[PDB]
Every structure is written in C-alpha cells, then in structure tokens.
Symmetry: C3
C-alpha cells in the first residue's frame, strides 16, 4: 500500500478502557482496512501492590498496570499517539511485539518528558501480542515497573477453532500478569523510596535473583477479587487474554478449563483444546476461550500455587446460574 | 442424559494400586458409560526423602506420593469416596482438574478428621489430569507436601495419533514429580518437626524462594532407580504419564524419545512427535508414548540436569532384548 | 540396513565451523543415504564470560561453546570421531539426543585423556537435537561448563510448513544458550581457579540455587554483538537454531517474529506460526524461520528481560536493505 492509499483509508478514534475490561470492538471486521487511532499518556506514579501497603514506583501506559488492551483487525493500521508529560522524569518509548521493524517501534518512539510522537504500523499478523517500553540501558527495570500491556489483532473474519468453526465470545477480559521485585530491609520488610531513581540499585539486586517478591494480576494482590471479581453466567462464552512481558506463567481456571487455548497467542496457530493448565512464556500473550457450565466462584491463577497463593497471582470469577448435577454432584456431603 | 438414565448406569468398584503402577483397565472402553467407583483413605505421615534421612510430614492420598492414578473413559462418571481418618489432624479435600464445577470438587469435599465424603463427576474431556488437595488458604502447602496425583480419562475408542492411527501401549507407568521445600538450620542441616503444623512457617519461607530443596519421582530420591527401576522389552510400547501439580518439568528419556507426546496431556490435542524433551507446566499432567528399540538401562529425567542429578528428579528403565547395530554401534571403542 | 549395506554407502567428510555459523550442506538431500563423518577434539580451556573478566573452566567440543552444529539428513548415519587430548585432565563422552540407544551414545563413548572413540548412529528422526557430555556422577557439572551443542537432521526433502509448502532458507545461524553458575567470595566478587576440579565444590553449591549468575549465547556476554553480530538483508529467509542443554529459554527477535517455529525442534511436528516469543525447554533445541522485511539492527534475546539484559542473553542481527513505510512509519517524530 502506498502512502496515498493509506491516507485514503478511513480512520476511527478509539477510547481505551482500563484493564481487565476491553474497549468496544467488533469481533468480525467492519468493512475494509482502517487506521485505528489510539492515544496513551505515560504516567510515572506510586502504586500500592498489596494489602500491607507495599509501594512500587510504577511506569504506567495510560496510567494503569498493565497498560490497556488495544484491539484492531488483521491488516488494519494501528496509529498510536504516545505522550510523555513534562511531569515525568524518564525517557520512554514503546515496543509492539505485533509490529515489524525498529525494535517493534521502540527505535522511533523515544520521547523525553514534555514530548510526544505518533507511530503507525500495519498489523500483519493476527493474535494477541505484548507491548512494553524498552529504553536502551534499563529495559528490564522499566518493564518490571509495570510498563507493559498487550494488543489484540483479530482475524478480519473473527475467531475460529482449528477446523474452521467460528468461535464467538460473549465477554472478553484482559489479565495482565506482573512480576515485581521489591527491595526489603534487614527486617525483611519492604522498603519505600522518595523517587523512582532511589530504588534502582536495590531493585536490580532483587531482579538478579530471578525471584519476584510479588506476582500479581491487574497491578496488585487481589486486584481482581471481591467487588472487582470478573463475572459470567452458565452458558456464557468468555475469552480470557493473558500477558506476561517478562516471566513465564501457567494459567488455570480452577473448576473450569480452557476449551480452546491459543497458548502461543497467535490465531493462525491452531489452539489446543480441553486444557487444564496452559503455558505462556515471558514476553508473550496467550488467550483462552471457555463456555461456563457451572455457577459459583472460580479462581483463575498462575498454577505454580506458591506464586498464585503466596505471591498474589489469583483472580476470581463470579458465575451465576443453575448447578448441573450431571457434570458434578456431592453423593455424600462431608460426614462422620 | 435423563435422571433415570444416569441412575441406571452400571456401577463398578475398582481397586487401586500404588504408583508407578496402574490398576487394571482396558484402553478401548468395554461397554457403555459407567460410574467407576474408587475409594482413597488419606494418610498424614512422616516419610524420608533422601539418603540423609531428610523428613517431610507427607499428606498422601491412599498413603502414597504421588496419589494413585485413576483410569476411566470419556463420559464415564468417576465416583470417589474420600476418607479422612480420626487419626489425622488436618482438614483435606480433593480438586480434580478433570472435573467441572465447585473448584474441581474441592468446595464439596472438605472433610475433617473422622469424616468421609463421596463426590461424583462426569469425565467429559479426554486426557491425563492432575488432582490435588486444595483447602482454602493452604493450597500450596498441602500440595507441596505431596497431596497430589493424576487421573487418565481415555477416549472411549482408545488412543490415536494425529492421523487417526490407533496407538496401543503394552504397558503404562505413572511418574508423579514432587517439589519439596524442606527448612534448614543455620548450619545447613534439614530440620525435623514433631507435627506438620510445626513446620508451616519455616516451610512457607522456603516456598517463597521458589527454589525446591528436592525434586523427586514417586516421593523420594532414587525411588524409581536400581531395583525399583521400571521395565520394558525391545519392541514394547510404553505410555509414561507424568504430572507436576505445582511446578514446571521437562521430561526426557535418555537414550530414547517420546515418539508421540501429548505434552498438554489432552487427547483431543494432536500429540507432538519425535520429541527429545517435552514440557509439562506446573498444574498439569502429560503423556508420552514410546516403542523401545534398544536394550539396556535408560534414565528418565526432568532435563534441568541440576534438578535431575542434584535434586533427585531421575528414574530408570531396565530394558531387555537384542541390541540393534543399525541404529547404533561403536565403530571404535575408547582406546589410546 | 545390514552391516554390509551400510559399509557400501558413500561417505562424506564434513569440516566443522565455529558457531553461530554452520558448515556447508544442502537443505535437500543430495543423493541417497550416506555415512556423514565428523571429528571433534575436546578442549578443556579457560574462557572469559563477561566484561568483568569472570572466568569459567570450560569443557568445549571442538574448542567452542556451544559445540559446533552437525548437519545430516534423516536416515543418514552420523559417524563421530571424538578425541580427548592427553593435555586434558577429565574423562569425557558424548550423548546425542537424536540417537537411539546407550544413553544416546554416552555409554559407548567414555574416553580418558589420551583416548579417542568412533560412534555411529542412524539419524532416524528429523529435527534439531541437543548433544552433550554426561559423565555418570558429575553430569550437570560438565554441561553447565559449556560441554553441549546440537545437530540438525533435515528431512530428505528439506523443510516444509504445516501444509507441505517448501521452506527454503538463505541463511542459517546456530545460537547455543548457556547458563553458568560462577562462585563468588564474601565481597560478591567472582572467584578464579587454576584447575577445573578446583571449582567443582563451589560450583555445585551455586547450581543448587537453580539461579544462574550468567545466561549467555556463544559462551559470553555480548558474544554475538558487534564484530560477531549475525547479518542478513531485507527479503532474506533465515533459520535460527537455538539450543539449551540444561535450562528453559524463550527466544524473541526484537523487531521481528518467528514466521514458522518448530518450538519442540522436531520437523514432523507442525511448526507454530507468526510467533512473537517461542519456548524451548531445557534439554532441547528449537528452530525459527523468518524473512526479514525491515532493515536495521535487531536484538535476539531470551525474553525474560532480566536474563537477557542483566545476565547476558542478548544477540544482535544487522540487516541491510530499504525501509518499508507501509509496515511501519513515524507519522510524528519525537517532539515538543
Ligand atoms: O486447581 N488449582 O488449585
Ligand atoms: O542425554 N540425557 O541427559
Ligand atoms: O520486544 N523485545 O524486548
Ligand atoms: Cu518507559
Ligand atoms: Cu522504558
Ligand atoms: Cu519484548
Ligand atoms: Cu489434604
Ligand atoms: Cu489439603
Ligand atoms: Cu489445581
Ligand atoms: Cu565432558
Ligand atoms: Cu562430562
Ligand atoms: Cu540430555
């Protein structure tokens, strides 16, 4: 496509929504190729990641951890206006694993506080992909400070299983998993810092142990529980998009399954089926499609149970509906 | 199926056998759907896991670590009678990754010492699946104390390769891999405790490092080596079911391969072929099919060689038969 | 084939080249089955792995880390002459994951300093496979000292996608990833030893932590950058073979993708497509096929960014050619 043909394409401005929600979109593409426009302001901010009050000097796209999920269709163009407010102190940029060239866009988006840039790339490959900041000299630090998210490039024809049959979800949720490495003092207590820079040296030491102090969904322990628990109903089809820009994870829906799982996150790669626990490597996004068959509370976790229950990697799904005794029933309740 | 149709289904009691062995079963289903009945008594007991007398207060389904392998066919019902003797001191339950609803059955099987419960679930998805105890608030602890196992839900038509060609094994083994986190004193000696709960705090501290002190098969270092090595003969087709309820593993048959490997452990997902080393994520089970071609001793290991030879993740296969010089031969034996 | 039939097969002597380059070969088999001959001399030498002068007493096949990549075709016979110089002090052998029998050849190739041996095996399974030393009693040690490599067993008819379409690469590179566990003194400084055996004890304690001090490509930090960066040009098809003999890895081409990826490294297992980041379990090799579309410098890393940018797992690709504004363009360059 020439610059003229591209400039002639229709454009649609999209308003991003905070994770785990996803902005309105059409599973099946509307018309031909479009230039989808997104805008994100980078915010360096202090966030609390657990009930104890542990602090992290986050570097958040659109002000959230993970950054929001941008959705486009294959062969559409994603035009991102990225802003780094003069209130920030570090240089930032963005790298789309979905894009091709200049380190995923990182080599063309280096912006200092008080600057902005607009990047456009053709979404040539369908699937879910990770995106993260990557400043030459402190890549891992920025990413484990929460500066990452994901995008979804849907086939123009929507989703299908490995045999041509359509897969249409009723709901979609984006679970961004984050590994945090918070310094501790001699008492084993998490340390606090005045500015993000102050924590760098101590943090790097923790990072080198390759042992995160916290592994959380949506920026904090329990962030997707209670009133923030995700929801569904028996019969409802749900697509759960999951990303981890730095460390491996192994998603598992307790009480359920991944009926169709694109574990590698790429739609032209047939999804695995009837999965109990799938695997997403650090630096990637994956997606699972499931039709709920039983009501009740479900937990969605990274299945290294220590990471799930001791480190923070557990979310909840509240599901309404009629219980199915054929699928499961208590013949004899706990009794003497 | 109607209420009457389900109640009319044949009920069959099956006696379990200890791992790595598997109870008698047929690969191709014999007759229509059945309600297969199993009973397991829970045992809390101290076990030694290495040659240094290191102890673990194990929580074992049916008295073994891993728990035994239950085998049923797709659409059969698995009805488990779970017993927690008055001699035990902890609460227990069971979570079947193969089941649908109530956290895999955990929310319906919480039993205190002196109680029993009967759970029935329809095995709707074919594959090998992990099962483990999962008491709200103490999941990882009981799981890494050995309270986990697996089940195999065979297709009613038996196993087949990605092309539809049947795969019939002559024998089957179940290797359950366990990550243990044993506390050590300031001198580096593993500590001993009077009761399970006494070790809780120290153990959780070790668990948080995400670094197991031991990684073993069948509950102890060397449990499947020497005189307890598994066996086979040249020409024999063997299915090796492998599980890890909490941590990733990478099985490898030294000297052999995984001719067909359902790495995700699910039969409707085509198996990978000619595998050197496969990957099973924590929270799942997988299965490898291999036809032995050469006689001799083979080592079956988790291929992070430190976990295999330093931590204990190594088993052996003793194979009888005639050597094949076409496949391999020493043209010049070691010499000056 | 009988002994006589094999002895009648044509032989071909191959000259090995140092990684990341691969010795001359043909993608499509040039003629019928033959006995491909290779010779490697084991070199026990000191190598500096980082810019801090950190040393490792390496055990290297053919004098390099990783060992060179041997290329044959399915059903050819690989005849390796392994030599252990009198100048060496340790016992060595070789285990081919691609071979069938005697622990992959390790039980037939044990050679003391001043000895040699000739092993011949039939490459019956197509794909990339790991090969490494495995001295009963100290396995993990030699392997994590750099004594491992890989070989490639191409289909007779060359490479194909999942649908049978031919995949012909213009260039091929072999990246051997290595996890090192270097002991430190009480000041956190890496220690040096005058003899290999001298570091054994100290090394074993670091290995127990399952936390490498270094994770590198081709034996050292920055080894595959600058004067050793891999090259290509827009439109060129490149196959990137990657192996890890002891620990998991998740390769990612920054700015690009893995158009076709045999993640398990086995050719009869259909490759995944449009990959952002793939996964290779410790004890295996994988291969990715990509056609560069953009010029510029690309980074190739193990996508646990701490491992890549802090521990050393990073390589570079220098690509010449013209920039493609359709795929990516900076609508608005960084500005006020
Ligand atoms: O099934 N996860 O506890
Ligand atoms: O070749 N097995 O370590
Ligand atoms: O997108 N590679 O860091
Ligand atoms: Cu940034
Ligand atoms: Cu950054
Ligand atoms: Cu990245
Ligand atoms: Cu229990
Ligand atoms: Cu329990
Ligand atoms: Cu579970
Ligand atoms: Cu050696
Ligand atoms: Cu060795
Ligand atoms: Cu090996």
């Amino acid at each position: 496509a020439t610059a003229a043909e591209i400039a002639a394409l229709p454009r649609q401005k999209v308003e991003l929504v905070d994770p785990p929600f996803v902005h309105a979109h059409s599973q099946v593409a509307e018309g031909g190729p479009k230039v989808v426009e997104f805008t994100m302001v980078i915010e360096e901010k202090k966030i609390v990641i657990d009930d104890a009050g542990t602090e992290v000097h986050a570097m958040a796209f659109n002000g959230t951890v993970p950054g929001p999920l941008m959705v486009v269709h294959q062969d559409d163009y994603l035009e991102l206006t990225l802003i780094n407010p003069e209130t920030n102190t570090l240089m930032h940029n963005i790298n789309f694993h979905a894009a091709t060239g200049a380190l995923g866009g990182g080599g063309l988006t280096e912006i200092n506080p008080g600057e902005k840039t607009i990047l456009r790339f053709k979404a040539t490959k369908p699937g879910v992909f990770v995106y993260h900041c990557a400043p030459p000299g402190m890549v891992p630090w920025h990413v484990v400070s929460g500066m990452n998210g994901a995008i979804m490039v849907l086939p123009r024809e929507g989703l299908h299983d490995g045999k041509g049959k359509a897969l249409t979800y009723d709901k979609i949720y984006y679970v961004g998993e984050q590994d945090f490495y918070v310094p501790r003092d001699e008492n084993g207590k998490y340390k606090k810092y005045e500015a993000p820079g102050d924590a760098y040296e101590d943090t790097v030491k923790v990072m080198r142990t390759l042992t995160p102090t916290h592994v959380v969904f949506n920026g904090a322990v329990g962030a997707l529980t209670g009133d923030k628990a995700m929801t569904a109903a028996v019969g409802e089809k749900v697509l759960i998009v999951h990303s981890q820009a730095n460390r491996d994870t192994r998603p598992h829906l307790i009480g359920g399954h991944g009926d169709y799982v694109w574990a590698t996150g790429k739609f032209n790669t047939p999804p695995d089926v009837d999965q109990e626990t799938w695997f997403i490597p650090g630096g990637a996004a994956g997606a699972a499609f499931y039709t709920f068959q039983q009501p009740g509370i479900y937990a969605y976790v990274n299945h290294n149970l220590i990471e799930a229950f001791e480190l923070g990697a557990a979310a909840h799904f509240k599901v309404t509906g009629e219980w199915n005794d054929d699928l499961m029933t208590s013949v004899l309740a706990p009794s003497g």
